[PDB]
Amino acid sequence: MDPDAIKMFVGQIPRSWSEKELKELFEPYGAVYQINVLRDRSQNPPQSKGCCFVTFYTRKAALEAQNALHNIKTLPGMHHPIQMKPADSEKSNAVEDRKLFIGMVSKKCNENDIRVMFSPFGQIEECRILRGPDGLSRGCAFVTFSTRAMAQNAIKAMHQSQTMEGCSSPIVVKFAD
DNA sequence: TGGTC
Ligand SMILES: [Mg+2]
């Protein structure tokens, strides 16, 4: 398979189908490397959970199949069309693993001051000062970078690097809970 | 109030 191939998750497959029927469904869109039905072994006999993974050899074939099938094609006996999307095992750079909690921020700071402070470390895609139900700043912020490496460099360079106005302790910079 | 969506 190509180094950029995508394993795809496919839902709304008839439980009666196996890899044999799925091979006939998918191969017209491109060469298929692997098909695996997700199975339930909780009792005897085991059964299909009604979904599968398909890995095309090429990324282009995976994307064309997804474009052609997802919410388009209804398989026999089904009441809803195929759902098709990249498999969760393909996720690599999750937002939660590149989001920082910034603590001990001056209650005066706004999202723009934080961006100015953390911009040197990479592309910021989200920045929020945290506010309670009264609307008052809670003295902390969330900063999401585009990659985890950016977030880690910000931690090493900024954690306890200074104490802001009105704060009892130096700024805290850590991966968010 | 050292406060994590
Ligand atoms: Mg408090």
How far apart CA A122 and CA A99 sit, in angstroms, is 12
Q: How far is the CA of A148 from the centre of ligand 1 (A)?
A: 29
Burial class (CB in 10 A: 0-12, 13-18, 19+), A161: exposed
Question: Token digits for A151?
Answer: 């977030």
Q: How was this structure determined?
A: X-ray
CA distances from A176 to A29, A43, A81, A115, A132 (A): 42, 40, 38, 17, 18
- DSSP character at residue A98: G
Closest listed residue to residue A84, CA positions, set A35, A119, A45, A123: A35
Ordered by where they begin, the domains of chain A are 2-91 (3.30.70.330), 92-177 (3.30.70.330)
- To one decimal, the resolution in angstroms is 1.8
Cβ neighbours of A26 (radius 10 Å): 23
Q: What is the residue type of A143?
A: V
Helices then strands, counting H and E runs in chain A, come out as 4, 8
Query: Which protein residue lies nearest to nucleotide B4, measured between its Cα and the C1' atom?
Result: A177
How far apart CA A159 and CA A26 sit, in angstroms, is 50
Query: Which protein residue lies nearest to nucleotide B3, measured between its Cα and the C1' atom?
Result: A138
How far apart CA A99 and CA A177 sit, in angstroms, is 9
Q: Is the CB of A122 under 7 A from strand B?
A: no
CA distances from A145 to A51, A97, A155, A156 (A): 34, 9, 12, 14
